Design a protein around this ligand. Structure first.
Ligand SMILES: CC(=O)N[C@H]1[C@@H](OP(=O)(O)OP(=O)(O)OC[C@H]2O[C@@H](n3ccc(=O)[nH]c3=O)[C@H](O)[C@@H]2O)O[C@H](CN=[N+]=N)[C@@H](O)[C@@H]1O
Ligand SMILES: CC(=O)N[C@H]1[C@@H](OP(=O)(O)OP(=O)(O)OC[C@H]2O[C@@H](n3ccc(=O)[nH]c3=O)[C@H](O)[C@@H]2O)O[C@H](CN=[N+]=N)[C@@H](O)[C@@H]1O
Ligand SMILES: CC(=O)N[C@H]1[C@@H](OP(=O)(O)OP(=O)(O)OC[C@H]2O[C@@H](n3ccc(=O)[nH]c3=O)[C@H](O)[C@@H]2O)O[C@H](CN=[N+]=N)[C@@H](O)[C@@H]1O
Ligand SMILES: CC(=O)N[C@H]1[C@@H](OP(=O)(O)OP(=O)(O)OC[C@H]2O[C@@H](n3ccc(=O)[nH]c3=O)[C@H](O)[C@@H]2O)O[C@H](CN=[N+]=N)[C@@H](O)[C@@H]1O
Ligand SMILES: CC(=O)N[C@H]1[C@@H](OP(=O)(O)OP(=O)(O)OC[C@H]2O[C@@H](n3ccc(=O)[nH]c3=O)[C@H](O)[C@@H]2O)O[C@H](CN=[N+]=N)[C@@H](O)[C@@H]1O
Ligand code: NA
Ligand code: NA
Lengths: 346, 347, 347, 346, 346
């Protein structure tokens, strides 16, 4: 549900703004809230085409289409007036595009976020949920470094704005299974083309999250996050070599593997909580919550006083979570209707 | 050597601009270049008071004092006209203050650097060297993250602007030994006051670099870096417990150790080259050079083509260099005039 | 012909920048210039995903993919360095979305164009061709008004900057046949689904232009426009009722027609040249050239001196060109591969 | 009067801001409100001279002189604090000056307006009345195109701001008779110089409005416009050939006519309501009101659903209004004290 | 005390912001308020070092350290939220640095001040006290001219903002005795080096103010200034030749004097109140208060109506105040612990 258990919450008079609202996450979130009594869902983005396709597709009076840009504070102000909740998903998110145009990454992902937070604070928005990526933890590419910096920026407001004025929090998850351009559809197309599957490093591990998992994470933060939190879903992982086997077997395919080597900007394993975060997080069940530290702007935690619990802690990553067997991966894959439709047609 | 063996530069008609000029780094680089034939060293910062002290202290006709702020392009442009070389050291560099004010860290360390680079390109500057830190590699704190992003910003120029137009490169090094506020003067003060030494985690390792090491790394980049390069100096490391022991012994002191635990914003070990950087780097001897990849803006190294050499590389860090022994740390500590003076003053 | 008969251009050392590069117009111009000796075609937009699809689809070394936004001058300047030719197609071009967000239409279509022009002048670009629409002539909707104002902005340069510095011109054409979201694919879908064809006003006339027509108009301007020129392609028109009949017949289909009435934001007939433009234009054959007036900034053509030729001119519009017959419309519709494929797939 | 009939309106505690307040319309509006109990009339403009001449001329404690620029939002904010009503008349309004410097036209007429609207909304201004021109309908020159765009910008706020917060509307009229530089004083001076009257196109028609007519239009909008309205005064027209005859006869002059031809940037006839506007306007008597459409940002009126009433409608212009005879034009001319003083001295 | 006599004032829930808070005045003001029940003292400046030294030095939970820049309105907004009082001391204040970089002087001293005032007005700050210098009266160098302009800017808000919203006032004093770089420590070091004292012009007069005097002036304005006031402390002066004698005698030193001549950018005498200010000030005892004129923006005081009291008035400067004898100067010097410690060690 969209409401905590035993909660006195009604959406009848509320307005949700989604930035990046035409992207595929913005889109699944929109569908989740359309099934609610929310008054208005504002879809905010520069893409007049995407907006018109959605408008015609859903034909739903809850949906409002705003043209604007997170880089421009006046364009954000216009869509922010009267809004109660913001799911901030606008971002430059491709690794190579950010690597070659990092100033562009900073204007959208960092300054764009700060525009949206300042405007939500000015308009008395109740909640802002910022989206981030496991590429933000111990980051190595311009994309993940811009998102790690975006986290620092949204966290820093909790050392400055009253939760009862505007609650600001964020969610961090890995690439979603079967998202466009990702390795599941790459492999599947290779299978169907009778071409070899190109594996970078078969011993790489990545967390496995469906789109539905990633939408539930955003809804969990929307319901339970306190201001300054970063919220992560616990998730299993697999090696890429095993994901490939799994897809081979499901499609009963005989395609060879071709090892192409690790690409620029990629880790062997992804981290979801650094050592410090893991040391300080609270376990909410299927989620970890990382509370903002030093909300009173006391510096001494950084300088004079330390914690032997940080000294003793480990980081949370795709090598030390539950690494799925080949049969577990097939099972998880069969929960994805994307995989199922492709499996049928084959 | 401000110049490669077998080279001559006239610096005689050249102009060096140092941002961050009044800080202790700009200051040691400044002093290095005063002993050259350089025509003019422009000290650029907003600290009018420190500028006046440096002016009075050195009393040297080569030095010019410019007021201005890397956050303001017109302020930089005023100081950049006719400059040949820029050492870009302006930064917000404390961890806690970047953590709490990260928009200010982006404004000075990222947007400020881009202002300096765009103006240096506009004014036909020959080289810009950007200073960075080992806290930028696999960064955890807002400060190291902002410096990581600055590195991506200065490297991205080498895939747009042409080396014989403006060579743009950077150096990355760890905390300098005996710097203002760092653990060596902390520990020495604790000794002298007869108080216990507050150790966070005795098994932490940190690269050991003197100020003169760091100044040599900048000069090595100035002479030898190509556009897009990140230059690092190979360095030994020590554990924090052995650094305490070494000082305790040099000072013949018996203060207790008190373990206060790991502070927020800090790692067990520092990384100087990530796995991908190590795999791609060139060994210059006592230095590694990380060349910029994909100078022609081709995306296929990121998407379709990979490299097995990245796959079986690992990272260069303060646990896998040479970790000094207690007696090696004392030998290094004794090379520092700060340590000698403290020790002398101690009887 | 990317070059006038009796000319040679080496494009071999030349660089073309397309703003709006990922849209369907930039895409067809791009494909046109891939078959030339052009050194590099830079696709400029903020759509990182569409850029990656184009990159993978074409796999052509001439293509470079730049992230950036016509609203940001430094973003444009990065992509404009060393460019020889700019096709400026970036725009907000839907009517309802410019109507409801007209400040966004001004930011992208007017201020965005001025950013592109100032940077092209700064970087010594040889030509910029700006794309415009017949909704800009006697405009009624925020979209056509913003494009009318963009035309005034690019024409006003020719009364300031010098042709052998940067030639600046534009093309104006109507909706392209079978474009995304346009009435032809609407009607074909309605046929295939066995639903009635929703006609607004059957007596509306619109100029008929294919995508290849439109691409030829841009190439005609690139070869032949002078600075300040607005170029238009002469074109026939049809009424909307005959376009429906033509499709109904090609598809041997019997769907009813439903009249829904004129929508907000639309005219009965489109204008391609106003009265003043017609009076002043040169006939190039299948094209009209509208020269920029008063290149020396003299005001007297506006105040003290008039022209009897403007007085007895009229306007070039979709009612006074050649209005195609049903059978002529079917002949034109059959030249489009989109229509052929739809028709083929239909049995 | 300044107050609707039967209305409970008092100006005792209200503040009016006029931008472009030193221009000749700003000036007649000022004189109209000086005859009221308004507390303060702020005259806002860059022209320190014009302001000091007015200050000395009127010597009236209601008048306050602010220096500022509609292009600068901070300069507008300073004059906007505590204001109840704004008559926004600042503009670049010469045809050739806008044609040659259209970026200048956009910064004053379009962005300048958006600065004034955002600031009036921030300061809780009750009413903003924007002035526009018949050159804005089916516009052909940079000046009228910038004003047509300005209309779209002020209308668009009614799809976003509550009338009870800030009512935003606009008025559209043609050139005013006997305004400086206009054809009535040009002709009259030709008469007095014994030179031929230079007529562009004798068959051109233009609406005839006195300055007093144009001030009554602004007051009518101030009293009755709802948010998003464009308000036009019904007005007769004349051919230029007939205006010239009329002036010739009134002055009993024998001057020849010289035909100089249509100039750049001029239409044969002016439009006051386009076809779409005319189809949707309400007739208030001597005025038409064009209501803002789609205030709920429903797109479908643009895309899926049409109106056969638009299909059937005609536009409202100076050829299809009442075209005055030569005797009617003389009569109207004799109501203008400008014409009378010139007639006497002659 | 920090509270007027008989005043109902409590600092328990109040927040003070100090810009330029790491400079030596910002620092003495901070120490004064630390001795009070104020809830928070925010130290605002770009100098992360200075801030950390203070934090460690005082180790006091009242102190909060903000990084920011008066030149950036968003950086000021962050530190201004929830603030009750601002002591605005950020400035470029060296004569030669402003002379050579006057654009820099204008961005910090003039535009920086206007950022801080606009933000204090937006955040409903109760009081802003701006600091200025006697070099601002009849100014001759870029530094004093930028500060004279800063005074005009803060005064001008009182012709526009209600005191009950935000009271804006300023204090004007000369260089403080024994401040860093000033002539007392220069001379003293000359004495101790056995070098000649370099005197510019022995007949120059300057007002003598201790740091404690200058802090009491700021506290007096904080307690009693009304909006638009400039507040000056009455102060005696000395000739430089006499200051030098005094120091010579106190240290029983035989150093010669060397006359170096007047330097660029220096007056013979400093003015604290111009003629106009002196004519209009109220004498509060040990302070003069200069009230803002024409708070209703009536121009006529400038143009049509004059005051024979201005015609008759004199200016208040270091030649017409009480010029101290050599023995008086020694006495005043001995109240400065700086002088005392130096005297001892010698
Ligand atoms: C374009 C690019 O270089 N990488 C975009 C992409 O992020 P990335 O982490 O590469 O995800 P993927 O699903 O491709 O690889 C997963 C695993 O399979 C491996 N992999 C991948 C491709 C391949 O051919 N073979 C292979 O083994 C690969 O090494 C890894 O171990 O998609 C992201 C998010 N997509 N969404 N939403 C964007 O942020 C990025 O810009
Ligand atoms: C303020 C702060 O949090 N750290 C500033 C500082 O970065 P940092 O890495 O802390 O260097 P240090 O010299 O303090 O620690 C070395 C080792 O001693 C250990 N350490 C440190 C302090 C102590 O009391 N005990 C202790 O064991 C400690 O855990 C570590 O393992 O110095 C940087 C460079 N400039 N200087 N100095 C600034 O960028 C930073 O803001
Ligand atoms: C969204 C919208 O309102 N109109 C977009 C569109 O501009 P437009 O002029 O509508 O072109 P079209 O191809 O729809 O109509 C042709 C004729 O068919 C008639 N028409 C149209 C639709 C219909 O259902 N019935 C009908 O008779 C119609 O009245 C007309 O007489 O296409 C433009 C260019 N890009 N495309 N496609 C975008 O700039 C616009 O935002
Ligand atoms: C400077 C310029 O080119 N035109 C300014 C002007 O707008 P415009 O519409 O020309 O009004 P006018 O009163 O001149 O012509 C009326 C009729 O008489 C005709 N006309 C005019 C001059 C002439 O010599 N002969 C003639 O027949 C003319 O063709 C037309 O049919 O004044 C406007 C508003 N003025 N006010 N307030 C400004 O917006 C413009 O910048
Ligand atoms: C750097 C510079 O040129 N002047 C800074 C300085 O302001 P200023 O008024 O010079 O004060 P000082 O204490 O030096 O002279 C007092 C008298 O002694 C005389 N004087 C001074 C020096 C000397 O060698 N001999 C001498 O006779 C001198 O002529 C004068 O009659 O300190 C100021 C504030 N400092 N604080 N806080 C800054 O605003 C300025 O930038
Ligand atoms: Na922040
Ligand atoms: Na708008």
């Amino acid at each position: 549900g969209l409401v905590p258990r035993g909660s006195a919450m009604g959406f009848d008079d509320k307005i949700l703004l989604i930035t990046g609202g035409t992207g595929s996450f913005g889109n699944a979130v929109m569908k989740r809230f359309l099934d609610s009594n929310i008054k208005e869902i504002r879809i905010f983005s520069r893409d007049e085409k995407k907006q018109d396709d959605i408008r015609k597709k859903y034909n739903n009076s809850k949906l409002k289409f705003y043209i604007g840009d997170v880089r421009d504070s006046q364009s954000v102000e216009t869509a922010m007036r009267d809004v109660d909740y913001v799911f901030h998903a606008a971002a430059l998110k491709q690794v190579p595009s950010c690597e070659f145009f990092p100033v562009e990454a900073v204007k959208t992902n960092i300054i764009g976020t700060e525009n949206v937070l300042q405007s939500a604070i000015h308009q008395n928005v109740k909640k802002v949920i910022c989206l981030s990526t496991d590429k933000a933890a111990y980051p190595i590419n311009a994309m993940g470094i811009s998102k790690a910096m975006m986290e620092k920026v949204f966290v820093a407001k909790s050392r400055n704005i009253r939760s009862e004025q505007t609650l600001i929090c964020g969610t961090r998850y890995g690439n979603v299974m079967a998202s466009r351009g990702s390795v599941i559809p790459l492999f599947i197309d290779k299978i169907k083309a009778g071409e070899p599957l190109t594996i970078t490093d078969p011993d790489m591990t990545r967390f496995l999250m469906s789109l539905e998992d990633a939408v539930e994470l955003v809804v969990h933060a929307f319901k339970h996050a306190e201001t300054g939190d970063i919220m992560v879903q616990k998730a299993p992982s697999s090696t890429v070599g095993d994901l490939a086997t799994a897809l081979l077997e499901l499609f009963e395919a005989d395609n060879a593997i071709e090892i192409i080597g690790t690409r620029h900007g990629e880790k062997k394993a992804e981290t979801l909580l650094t050592r410090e975060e893991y040391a300080q997080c609270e376990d909410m069940g299927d989620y970890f919550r990382v509370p903002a530290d030093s909300r009173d702007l006391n510096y001494s935690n950084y300088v004079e006083t330390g914690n032997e619990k940080i000294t003793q802690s480990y980081e949370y990553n795709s090598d030390n979570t539950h690494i799925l067997t080949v049969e577990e991966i097939k099972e998880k894959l069969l929960t994805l209707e994307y995989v199922r439709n492709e499996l049928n047609d084959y």
